[PDB]
Amino acid sequence: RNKIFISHATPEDDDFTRWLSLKLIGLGYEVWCDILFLDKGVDFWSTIEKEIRENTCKFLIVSSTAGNKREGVLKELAVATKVKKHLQDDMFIIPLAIDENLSYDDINIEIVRLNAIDFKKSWAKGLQDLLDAFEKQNVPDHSKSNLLYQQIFLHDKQAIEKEETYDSNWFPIISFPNELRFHRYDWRLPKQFDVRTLAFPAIRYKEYLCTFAWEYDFIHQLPKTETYNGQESIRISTSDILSGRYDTDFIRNYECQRLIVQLINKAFELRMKDKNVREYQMSKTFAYWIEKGKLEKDKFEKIKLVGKQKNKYWHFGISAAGKLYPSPVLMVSSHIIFTMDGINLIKSKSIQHSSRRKQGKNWWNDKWREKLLAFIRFLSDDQNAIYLNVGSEEKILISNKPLKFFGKMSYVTPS
Amino acid sequence: MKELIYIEEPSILFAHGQKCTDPRDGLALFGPLNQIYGIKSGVVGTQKGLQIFKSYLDKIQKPIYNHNNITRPMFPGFEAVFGCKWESQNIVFKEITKRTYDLVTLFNDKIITANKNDEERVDVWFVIVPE
Amino acid sequence: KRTYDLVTLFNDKIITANKNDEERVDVWFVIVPE
Amino acid sequence: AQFHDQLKARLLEHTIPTQILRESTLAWRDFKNTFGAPIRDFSKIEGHLAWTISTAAYYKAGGKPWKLGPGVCYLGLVYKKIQNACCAAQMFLDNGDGTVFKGEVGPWYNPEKGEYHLKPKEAKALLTQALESYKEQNKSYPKEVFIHARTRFNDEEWNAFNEVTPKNTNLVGVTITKSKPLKLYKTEGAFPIMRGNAYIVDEKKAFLWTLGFVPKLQSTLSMEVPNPIFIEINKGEAEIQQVLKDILALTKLNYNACIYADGEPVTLRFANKIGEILTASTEIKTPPLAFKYYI
């Protein structure tokens, strides 16, 4: 009795029936699709007789517009109803509607009452619905077929409508020094002096030294800057240029934002010297990574920032670059710095690349989030901020909490 | 907190007009759009390269499994998916027995002479480069 | 000259189809009118 | 280094679809690292490999594996460093619902060393070539010329585009940038941000997650944490919603591979591939302009 019988429109509705038939045999169900199983020579209507009446477990109609008015499928359906009455099994017939050009009020009265399984615009989802119906009605290799069955179920996996929250990589600038100051060091500042070696961030622009620091701070390495008149310096409100309403022939808005970005980066580079953390070169910028043995159990706030891998040591490191396009913010980037024994860096870069790839092979979102957050919180001075020394009286605050995001669509995390 | 909007994942249509998202599932379910009757493979390489290509072409026909079939779909087999024959017994083989320029020239001139002079039509030339 | 351009029509049609079009053609059946 | 691209360029004159296969790819088990596992460990990806190769073959034999699901020409142009060579790919829909996914070849040359921008004459030539291709294919001029690139469009080349284009056509310029350091994590689970998320920074610029975790595969298209692609409508007038939808649609047609999706639109990637192939060897007049000869 275990056999699923498929009736359909023979002349012009063969592709769907064929695909469904071989899909059903691939799932393990015995089928009697006529264009695939009707033997040649045999009396076709008597074989339909024997198949529907004797050993048919379930009867499927294909309810396209070609069907529901064709004599063969109508006869097949009527005898299916006869078998339904004899068997007294609920939903012995399972109509399948593929064509979208007929409505539920034009389906023939023989099967209109019973619910047709949706095949209008998704054959795979309709096939999964049919499989679920077969499981519900208990319609009757062990490793090959489950792949196809799970693929049928999984082909339509989408994101569920659930709220999801995310930690970003950016860290916002909480506050800025009120004044960006251009000191007039026409002759006090030596021309060939390197301002990047200055104790506090400052850059040479248009016969001026522009910085966030007081003009009297550059004394230890710039003795001649002493006794400099304060009226020569020109001060601009930082928020004025950040919002972009400041625009002056002396200095353009975009260029002034660029110099503030340079000041933020330079101040970060100076601060990380003080923050008890070693440094490493990328082709672009600096990376700040902590030594092994200088953290308790290599652990800060239940997050391990340095560890071991294949008789080598890895340290989590960060590289920060300030930007002001969306808002005054500082974008971090996470890297792994490899050393031979925890104290001595590995000189050659190729093994650095290989070890970084090997380490990040098994790291994923949660690991990266914990390491980045722990590193930023470790370099922090107070609870919710990190200090950048741009002046003896002015500082730059970078928030410990990244820019949090959230979304209406997400998924179930696989177990 | 800034809201992340959603752009719905687009669906690529397949044979019979059935649209799915993954290439793999749509191909293994409904098959490709147009029917080509087969692939008359041309192979330009050494005898060992031809043997390797033939063995891999035989292996393609039968199903081959990924280590995690849910994460990455299986390959049912070339005839099962694409509906066309790409057998390894119908291979047009061209044996090979400034260095980059002449190395390219070898395979090149082989292919041009095969495409011009030879009668055996080739759908796509599988240049099996040595190592 | 009429022969040259009449040949050119079918010719460049075939070359653009063999060059630009993705669908492969094994042999091009030039259905010449009468 | 230049085996594949130069080989394709040399066969480019007489159209011959070819697929290059390394011996270490087809039979990766035999050739080992001489001290252990094979050099290219393909054990976990074998069937996937057998997927892509087959798909590639099926594409190079004249078969169409999949389509997209009007009036918009997607023109992705990529600049090659040699002088600079702008090579483009175009994608649109015909009247029979088919997706015409040719290139836009006949590379246009900027003599400047680092100016990744088309000169007015070459910009006009590129746009009129793409528009003529669309006109001969769809019998009518496109309603929208979605020109996207990896560079920002300058003013003179945009003016050239806007003067060569005809009326009733609104062409929009998009810039797609990879490796922008917006690593957006997930605090709750151990899995990354799932693909499809878009972060609308401004009305014209946004961060699209064309790659990441996918629910349908229970895994991620990208290892570690996904890198979003920055999508900026620097030139032209269009909605960021529709532009991101278009980019996500274009991230599906990588016929060169059998993968769920790639992180960048396939138009840009294919234009880059054909441009590299063109610049590999000498100049070719009226090249084939079809991807089976390049990818």
Added chain:
Amino acid sequence: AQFHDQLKARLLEHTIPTQILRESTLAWRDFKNTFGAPIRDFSKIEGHLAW
């Protein structure tokens, strides 16, 4: 006169196997002589023509 030869020659550089068929060959019945039987009476050789 020289359509076939020129057409086959111009495709030699980009090798494209081509077959030229006339409309009076594939469908010979449609073209009469305005007076009766078609110009190219292929009735006795239709099978051979197909061959």
Added chain:
RNA sequence: AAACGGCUCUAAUCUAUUAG
């Protein structure tokens, strides 16, 4: 070069400014 990614290295350009 089956492929897609993450990372690494390197170069160039455009700006603004300063020394040639």
Added chain:
DNA sequence: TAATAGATTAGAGCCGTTTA
């Protein structure tokens, strides 16, 4: 012409194969 930055851009290589 050199330099010091920041923003774009571009190439090449190199490793892993996407937590069950």
